[PDB]
Ligand binder design. Structure first.
Ligand code: GTP
Lengths: 50, 49, 76, 292, 99, 49
């Protein structure tokens, strides 16, 4: 009635991708930023997809 | 027997096979490409190659 | 500082020590007993301050310095 | 389909191998008789040739009928060939490797994807034996499978310059070849050799077995030596002429020593690095079959 | 594939990986048609982000060929994919799903 | 400079361990405020002699 397997799959996908991006070691401060911004953006994409 | 090469001897031969490229070949025509510059100058390693 | 005479042992030791305190090679300690540490690549990376591609590889993946079979340490 | 005799395809007059010389179609043996060798202080000893790799390179999906004999002969003796490993159509030989493949190797030296009318072709079993080995030319460029291109030339020297005692010994002095010579003699020699239908030789070389094989190896020793000669001139460090009282002796230094040279020269064909790797591979395989 | 030139230095470059994941979802068929060509991009991704695992993987081989009885046979040899290989026996090895 | 090299060899940042011990990075990186919610702390303020 409510849950959608497709959307929820994309949700585990972006979960994995956020774990991937989170473990990405970086040296520059700006890269450090774009990492966390990238994570927020993934959390956005999941809602568009759902 | 293999044939005698024509330049080995002094007779003139007036019918000869000439290889020729066809319409499907073309040489020296200018050619198009997609150049793609690096996203950051500071990401470009010069060495150790 | 001492053009004509031996460096007094106290100064030699204290400077050598403070400089030893200054050094820290990147590494990922592990429990495998077969493992070694690629001293050459680590000290090199450190010397270039991790700017060379090897220094990048090391600053991001220090574990790459650890190795069992000696050759693979570089193949990696 | 061409039947293969109890001897090789090489027994057929259709496949005679003959360099031009003194205005006639000379056999390779009667050219090699002209050759004479000055010894030098250096010695060649022949190391064991490494066993060729088990791998047969993929015959990539190719719609076309590859002209293979032309590719091989030009890669070995061709005056102008280069980047021979760029295209990598040598791998195509492994299409012939399979049992009951549709593909045929024509006497034309072309690898047809399917049997086609009015094109005579070698017996498929023979070609399969031949492809099981020579398809490995297709991996002459890949780093894992490259042949040594220095030590192998020792064998070349022994198989060319070497006296029967030097051959039994496995060690001969490095030699310096020479012969009475016409202008452009090595260019003309190499071009007489590019026209040779060498797949006949390689196919009999891989298919024949028993006494029938050994009887081949004696009969075609001089042919193999002519191929080796052209390669030798291709890799020789220098190729001078000598005045000898209104006669000229061409002289190459040195037999059996690859100088690794790649800059072109008028006197002889030149190997680009790709031709070196290829020729090294070819020698690896061919000498492997030749000594078994 | 309409080739990307991505080097995958910045974290944001995960975007390109995502561009493929979505494509593999919305269009699995077309994806499967171009997947070797997208493996060439992914390899630049893995060699930066996961150099150790990348070395182990590529050491196993960049491609494989299923044989008789269905076993995979990885090449053991790193080599760039070309769409010339799509009609051949070879497969991109990122998609082998062999642990 | 000397004290600096000794300090920064230890690491620009640290993380408190679940066991409570500090664990310095051993790296010299510029801090970003994205790090403020991260596990890491600036090492100047560790108060570890
Ligand atoms: N930078 C650096 N160079 C090294 C290291 N280890 C070996 N080398 C260099 O690599 C070169 C080759 O190594 P070796 O096979 O030991 O050569 P070597 O000349 O016999 O070295 P010696 O023991 O000094 O006689 C040597 O010249 C060393 O200077 C290292 O850990 N770091």
């Amino acid at each position: 009635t409510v849950t959608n397997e497709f959307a929820s799959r994309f949700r585990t996908i972006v979960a994995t991708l956020a774990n991937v991006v989170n473990e990405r070691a970086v040296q520059d401060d700006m890269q450090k930023a774009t990492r966390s911004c990238t994570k927020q953006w993934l959390r956005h994409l999941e809602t568009q997809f759902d | 027997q293999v044939g005698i090469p024509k330049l080995e001897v002094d007779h003139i031969s007036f019918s000869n096979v000439v290889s020729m490229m066809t319409a499907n070949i073309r040489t020296g025509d200018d050619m198009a490409v997609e150049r793609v510059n690096p996203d950051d100058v500071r990401a470009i390693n010069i060495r150790n190659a | 500082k001492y053009p004509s005479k031996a460096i007094p042992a106290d100064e030699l030791i204290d400077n050598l020590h403070s400089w030893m305190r200054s050094v820290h090679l990147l590494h990922v300690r592990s429990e495998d007993n077969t493992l070694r540490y690629n001293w050459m690549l680590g000290v090199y990376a450190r010397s270039t301050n991790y700017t060379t591609p090897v220094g990048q590889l090391v600053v991001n993946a220090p574990a790459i310095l650890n190795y069992s079979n000696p050759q693979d340490a570089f193949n990696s | 389909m061409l039947q293969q005799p109890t001897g090789g395809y090489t027994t057929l007059e259709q496949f005679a191998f003959t360099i031009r010389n003194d205005g006639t179609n000379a056999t390779p043996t009667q050219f090699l008789q002209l050759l004479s060798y000055e010894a030098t202080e250096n010695e060649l000893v022949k190391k064991t040739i490494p066993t060729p790799e088990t791998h047969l390179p993929s015959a990539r999906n190719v719609p076309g009928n590859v002209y293979i004999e032309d590719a091989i002969t030009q890669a070995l003796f061709g005056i102008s060939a280069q980047n021979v490993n760029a295209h990598g159509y040598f791998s195509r030989l492994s299409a012939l490797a399979l049992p009951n493949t549709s593909a045929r190797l024509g006497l034309d030296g072309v690898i047809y994807n399917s049997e086609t009318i009015n094109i005579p072709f070698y017996d498929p079993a023979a070609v399969a034996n031949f492809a099981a080995t020579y398809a490995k030319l297709g991996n002459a460029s890949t780093p894992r499978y490259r042949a040594d291109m220095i030590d192998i030339y020792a064998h070349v020297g022994l198989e060319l310059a070497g006296t029967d005692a030097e051959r039994a010994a496995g060690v001969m002095p490095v030699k310096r070849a020479k012969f009475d010579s016409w202008e452009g003699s090595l260019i003309s020699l190499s071009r007489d050799v590019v026209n040779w239908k060498i797949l006949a030789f390689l196919i009999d070389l891989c298919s024949l077995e028993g006494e029938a094989l050994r009887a081949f190896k004696t009969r075609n020793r001089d042919v193999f030596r002519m191929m080796l000669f052209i390669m030798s001139t291709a890799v020789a460090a220098n190729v001078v002429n000598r005045k000898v009282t209104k006669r000229v002796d061409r002289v190459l230094e040195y037999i059996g020593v690859n100088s690794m040279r790649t800059a072109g020269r008028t006197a002889t064909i030149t190997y680009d690095l790709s031709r070196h790797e290829f020729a090294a591979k070819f020698l690896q395989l061919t000498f492997t079959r030749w000594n078994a | 594939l309409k080739k990307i030139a991505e080097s995958f230095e910045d974290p944001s470059s995960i975007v390109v990986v995502l561009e493929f994941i979505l494509f593999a979802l919305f269009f699995p068929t077309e994806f499967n048609r171009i997947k070797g060509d997208i493996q060439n991009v992914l390899l630049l991704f893995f060699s930066r982000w996961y150099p150790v695992e990348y070395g182990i993987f590529v050491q196993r081989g960049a491609t494989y060929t299923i044989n008789a009885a269905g076993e995979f046979e990885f090449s053991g040899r790193n080599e760039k994919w070309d769409q010339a290989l799509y009609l051949s026996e070879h497969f991109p090895a990122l998609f082998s799903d062999v642990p």
